[PDB]
């Protein structure tokens, strides 16, 4: 039960599902690692305001609507990942940049 979604954009933001792996990550967007009863909101350092606001909405949906409330949403920042994220993805590499939005 693992999914990853990329949250990329500006004023129109898209949440697209992606491989569960560090390779999918970049330092400029937000990602949502669905871990069942725990949901990880991870935003790159160079994330924009919009992505982080939509990222929060995407998280809400999984908990409220796919996990019927039974889920905690943990917000973290590039370089300060929860031990549980590193357990799943292995140790984080120097992440590549994000593209234009």
């Amino acid at each position: 039960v693992q999914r990853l979604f990329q949250v990329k954009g500006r004023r129109v933001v898209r949440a697209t599902e992606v491989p569960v792996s560090w390779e999918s990550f970049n330092n400029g967007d937000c990602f949502i690692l669905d871990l069942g009863n725990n949901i990880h909101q991870w935003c790159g350092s160079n994330s924009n305001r919009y992505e982080r606001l939509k990222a929060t909405q995407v998280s809400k949906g999984i908990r409220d609507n796919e996990r019927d409330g039974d889920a905690r949403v943990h917000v973290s920042e590039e370089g300060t990942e929860p031990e549980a994220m590193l357990q799943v993805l292995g140790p984080k590499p120097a992440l590549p940049a994000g593209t234009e939005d």
């Epitope: 973290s76 920042e77 300060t80 031990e83």
Partner: nanobody
Framework: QVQLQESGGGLVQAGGSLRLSCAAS????????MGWFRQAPGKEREFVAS????????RYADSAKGRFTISKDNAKNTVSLQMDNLNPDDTAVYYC????????????????????WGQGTQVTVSS
């Protein structure tokens, strides 16, 4: 598979002290929130103290403020609980716990926020 193991419980007299420790084993990549719970005979599982990933912000149950001091050692990957001025209402099995999902702040007072636990240690304060 991070594991937890408690040590250092034992017997103590009403007024005495005791120090509990929890060693985290298995592969880890970073620091994490840890906490102490206890369970008395009859009674159910209750919070005692929890600490943030860095050891910087702590929280204490009502029974616990003043007498207990929680600290963390991140290279050792342990957690400690110093228990001063013990009375027999403190007699219980004391459990180590970890919240690997929390990225900042101490742990909460609920057990369901803790995902990793040890098998406990016995603490007996007799009057």
């Amino acid at each position: 598979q991070v594991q937890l193991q408690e040590s250092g419980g034992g017997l103590v007299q009403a007024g005495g002290s005791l120090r509990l420790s929890c060693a985290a084993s298995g592969r880890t990549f970073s620091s994490f929130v840890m906490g102490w719970f206890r369970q008395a005979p009859g009674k159910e599982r209750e919070f005692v103290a929890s600490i943030s990933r860095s050891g910087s912000v702590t929280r204490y149950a009502d029974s616990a403020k003043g007498r207990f001091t929680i600290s963390k050692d991140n290279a050792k990957n342990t957690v400690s609980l110093q228990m001063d001025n013990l009375n027999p209402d403190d007699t219980a099995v004391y459990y180590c716990a970890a919240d690997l999902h929390r990225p900042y702040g101490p742990g909460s007072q609920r057990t369901d926020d803790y995902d990793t636990w040890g098998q406990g240690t016995q603490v007996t304060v007799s009057s």
